[PDB]
Each structure stands twice: as C-alpha cells, then as structure tokens.
Design a protein around this ligand. Structure first.
Ligand SMILES: [La+3]
Length: 579
C-alpha cells in the first residue's frame, strides 16, 4: 500500500515485520549508536498473557504499539502516550484442534499495517483486518482448512490495493499457494500455487524463465509421479519482499511434503524455489529451484533481502537469500540469474557446491554428495552426519542488511542431524513426514549450536562470526548507529558492532528470544524492543513439553540443555538510553 510506503519513509515507525519492503531490516535511526548502546537500559516491559513461542515483532505506527501473540493470536494495542496502556484487545476464537495440526509450534510471525487497518493472519488460516484505532473487524476470510492439515505461522504482505498471504503445512501433505486478497474488501483476487498445473501456478510457459531459459509447459507435473503433487508440499510460511520499481513479489516455497524421497520421485518442482510474481496478477516473471528433489526438509522459505549493489562493477538489482540448505544465494531480482551461491557455514556437507558454470549441464543444481543423501542411502537406513540439520543453517530468523557496511548480518544455526526415512501413507489431517531424526551441535567446532556471522554476498564469504552456545533463532536488526541487534535462546539481547562484531551490549530478557528486534522513535527518543518467549522449532521441547529425544522431529533432544537457562515466556522488553 501507499500507506505502507508512507510508513517506511518515516523511520520513527514500523509498519512491516520486515522493516521495509526489501526485507533489509535496516533502521535509519542513529540515536542508539555504537558508542552509547553500552548505556542502554530497559524503558518498560509488557507481558502478553500467552506462553509458547513468541516470533515476529510488534508494530508501532505513531503513538500506538501493536503487539501480537502466538495461539490464540491475541492482538494488544498499547498507547505509548498512556504509558503502554492497552487501548484495545482482539482475542479471536479458534479451535484447539489447530495446535496438534501445527508441525512447528504455535508461533505467529506478526502483523502488518495498511491504510488504517491492522492485518493479522491467524493460526487457523484466517486472514483478519482489524481497525487500527478501534480493533473492530473490517472483514475476515479463511484462507485454508486446518481440517486438511493447513495452518499459518507467517505474516501478510500488503501491496497497493491487495494483501498477499501464505499458507503452511509442508509436513502435512498440503499442496500450497500464495493468495492475494483485496485490502478494503477481503475478496480473493488471485491464488498462485507452488505446485500443480500451470493455471493455478499462474505461470507463462513461454515467457517465465528459470535460470534464464523458459520453463516450458507442465513445469511442475513433469517432476511429479502421478497425483502426488496434490499432496506435494511446497508451502509459504516465510517472509515476502516487494520491489515497487520492478512490480515483483518475492517469496520461497517450502518442502515437497513427505520426508521420504524415493516415495517422492522426481525433481518435485516447484518446491524449494525462489519465486518472483506480479502482485496484481500473481503470475511469476522468473523462478529458480535451489534444492531439486529435497531429501532433508531444507525449506526455501527464508527471506529474500532486496538490495541495490554493485556486482562486478555494474549496479544491479539484487536479491540475497540464506537458505536452510546452507548456501547464501545472490540473485538478480529482475532476471533471476543466480550470481553467487556459496556456503555460509563451512561444516555443511550435503553438497560440494552449487554448479554455476553456465554450460555445465548440472547448471543451477547443487552437486549432492552421495554419503549425505538420504535417498541414495535408501529408506529405513540412517543417514548419519548430515550438516546442516532439518532446521537448516538458518530457519525463520530473518537476516539484516546495512547499506553502509554492505554486509548481511544473519543469525545462523550450528547443528547437524541423523536422518532415517521410511514409507508412510498419506491421510488427510494427519502428519506426512516419514523420517526419524536426532540433532546435535556441529561436531568439529566450539560445541555451540549457533553463530552470528556477517556475509559478503558479492563474493560468498564470511567476514566475521561470533559463536553462540545455542542457536541464533532471534531476528537481526541493523541500524544507522553501526549496531546490529539480535536475541539468543538463553534470553540475551545482544548488540554488536556493525563492522568489527565485538559485543557492545548484553541484557537478560525473561525468556529465550525467537522474535525479531525492532526499533522506533516516540517523542523524539529512540527505543528498541524485542519479544521474548522461547519456542518455534528450537524450543519445541519446552513449548510442547516433549521429553523424548527423538520427538519434536529431532530438535527436542538436541536442545536438551536449553531448559537450564530459560522457561516458557510471553513478555515484551522495551529499551532506551537514559538521556
Ligand atoms: La517443512
């Protein structure tokens, strides 16, 4: 919306979960700089009344802060003039059946503001637009049916007069889509599936290119055996970016449903693909599959940070992506030409590299290593030693970009995985996994499960990296004060230097941070705030109370020591300078 573009241009507000349309997560405020964030103190706190996983980050537009929760996805409107008093509250009624039909915690990844309306995508696949000053329902539409195993954990994307939302359910045999609804009306405009025939992919067979060449007719179904594409996966629970100068919406599709690969023959397109669609029509100008025929649930849902950089001496519209598979992709966001595809974790071993010799015949395909390939070892056989784990080198936690240092501050994971798949029959509403997993820290390092690194995407190199005991599940935020903020799973809110990376601030929030750092300015004073409350898929053992080491799809036993540092939470901590 133009409202959204109006809000981005004002740095004192946060109208998008991704800070800006480009998902740079870059703040122009420089009051809290690299030489005074040592002197940061807590401004005020606020609790949500909700436990389990608090992902995302609160909105502020003007003098009202909008806070979201996990299930049942309550929204609080806090009047900053009234001392964070709750102006209005919207607690929606949703059925508790929806929670066992969520793979990956009750998490919700936040709100969006557009044209005097707050838009919330509930866990039961319900897109609601609330009045920004009232909290009254303008309209409400159900995007999917959790009956069939379809939930939502992601946020919305408001573009012009439309709102494009995603759907989750990769672990439940859902064939998925990215759907746009009218801002004022709530009426469905178009729906572009990740999988299926060309008419609901919204693809042009002769004009939409992948790796420069047109994808042709029946691009999806040529890689699927029979009607397994209807149970085909490829869902959309990540962040979406948008370029107004190119009129293109960018997202990534998730896993090809089942975790057993020989039961799932073919390239399984278009799962695990960078998508670039039109906002009004929904049909894609270009696309690119990063992980053809996924064997490890390396969901390509992660944010695509849109940059304008100089590549090879020529200024080029760029798109940078940190996939779970372990490769930091740099792409032309206009053509789709894959420029850089290097590893941002040196212990990743499932592929030697991504083949980028333009005439290599394996062009654009990662060279899968035979020893770390779950299908080549076969069903009912344990694939030991795969790095990264199924949660990937980096999961939902969004990376930040600073246009002044030109680097990408990405919070990563340092865990690996034992993998053993097996055949499972699909049943609607039930899990469609087919794998027993067990995770552990990376074997040849400092024993920690995470790293906060800076990334040069124009050459594919790690400039510096800060190790962390547990993973770095908190979203990063870079600001013009040459500081980068991020939250750890022991409850720490850390601020480091933009170039050097040395820790400058460290504060213990009440629970582990899986949310993203935001900042705002109220009455001329800059405040930065972060949501606490551990969960997601790194805290699934604490969120669901799981005790078995193999439960939680392998992550419950891997993060066993996490309960020595934190419990469940649901608090928002706001920071500022003393002035
Ligand atoms: La998945």
């Amino acid at each position: 919306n133009e409202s959204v573009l109006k809000g981005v241009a004002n740095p004192a507000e946060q109208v998008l979960q991704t800070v800006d349309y480009a998902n740079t997560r870059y703040s122009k405020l420089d009051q809290i700089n690299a030489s005074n964030v040592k002197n940061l103190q807590v401004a005020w706190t606020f609790s949500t009344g909700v436990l389990r996983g608090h992902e995302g980050s609160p909105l502020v537009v003007g003098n009202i802060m909008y806070v979201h929760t996990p299930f049942p996805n309550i929204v609080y409107a806090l009047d900053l003039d009234q001392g964070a008093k709750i102006v209005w509250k919207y607690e929606p009624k949703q059925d508790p059946s929806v929670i066992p039909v969520m793979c990956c915690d009750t998490v919700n990844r936040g709100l969006a503001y557009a044209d005097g309306a707050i838009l919330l995508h509930q866990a039961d696949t319900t897109l609601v637009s609330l009045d920004a000053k009232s909290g009254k329902v303008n309209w409400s539409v159900k995007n999917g049916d959790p009956s069939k195993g379809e939930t939502n954990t992601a946020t919305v994307l408001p573009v012009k007069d439309k709102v494009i939302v995603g759907i989750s359910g990769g672990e439940f045999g859902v064939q998925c889509h990215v759907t746009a609804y009218d801002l004022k009306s709530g009426k469905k405009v178009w729906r572009g599936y990740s999988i299926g025939p060309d008419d609901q992919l919204i693809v042009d067979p002769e004009k939409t290119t992948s790796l420069g060449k047109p994808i042709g007719k029946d691009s999806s179904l040529k890689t699927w055996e029979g009607d397994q594409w209807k149970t085909g996966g490829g869902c959309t629970w990540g962040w979406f970016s948008y370029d107004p100068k190119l009129d293109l919406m960018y997202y990534g599709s998730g896993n090809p449903s089942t975790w057993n690969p020989k039961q799932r023959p073919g390239d399984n397109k278009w799962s695990m693909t960078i998508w670039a669609r039109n906002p009004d029509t929904g049909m894609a100008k270009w696309v690119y599959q990063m992980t053809p025929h996924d064997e490890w649930d390396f969901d390509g849902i992660n944010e695509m940070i849109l940059t304008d950089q100089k590549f090879d001496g020529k200024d080029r519209p760029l798109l940078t992506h940190f996939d779970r598979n372990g490769f930091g992709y740099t792409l032309d966001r206009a053509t789709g030409e894959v420029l850089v595809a290097e590893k941002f974790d040196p212990v990743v071993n499932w592929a030697t590299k991504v083949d980028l010799d333009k005439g290599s015949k394996t062009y654009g395909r990662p060279l899968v290593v035979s020893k770390y390939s779950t299908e080549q070892n076969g069903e009912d056989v344990n694939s030991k030693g795969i790095c990264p784990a199924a949660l990937g080198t980096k999961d939902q936690q969004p990376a930040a970009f600073s246009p002044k240092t030109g680097l990408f501050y990405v919070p990563t994971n340092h865990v690996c995985m034992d993998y053993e798949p097996f055949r499972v029959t699909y049943t609607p509403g039930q899990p469609y996994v087919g794998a027993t997993l067990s995770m552990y820290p990376a074997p040849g390092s400092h024993g920690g499960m995470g790293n906060f690194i800076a990334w040069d995407n124009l050459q594919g190199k790690i400039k510096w990296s800060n190790p962390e005991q547990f993973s770095a599940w908190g979203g990063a935020l870079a600001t013009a004060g040459d500081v980068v903020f991020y939250g750890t799973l022991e409850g720490f809110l850390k601020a480091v230097d933009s170039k050097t990376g040395k820790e400058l601030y460290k504060f213990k929030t009440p629970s582990g941070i899986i949310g993203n750092v935001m900042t705002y300015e109220h009455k001329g004073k800059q405040h930065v705030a972060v949501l606490s409350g551990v969960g997601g898929w790194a805290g699934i053992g604490l969120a669901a109370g799981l005790t078995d080491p193999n439960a939680g799809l392998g992550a419950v036993g891997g993060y066993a020591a996490l309960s020595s540092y934190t419990n469940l939470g649901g608090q928002l901590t706001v920071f500022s300078l003393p002035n």
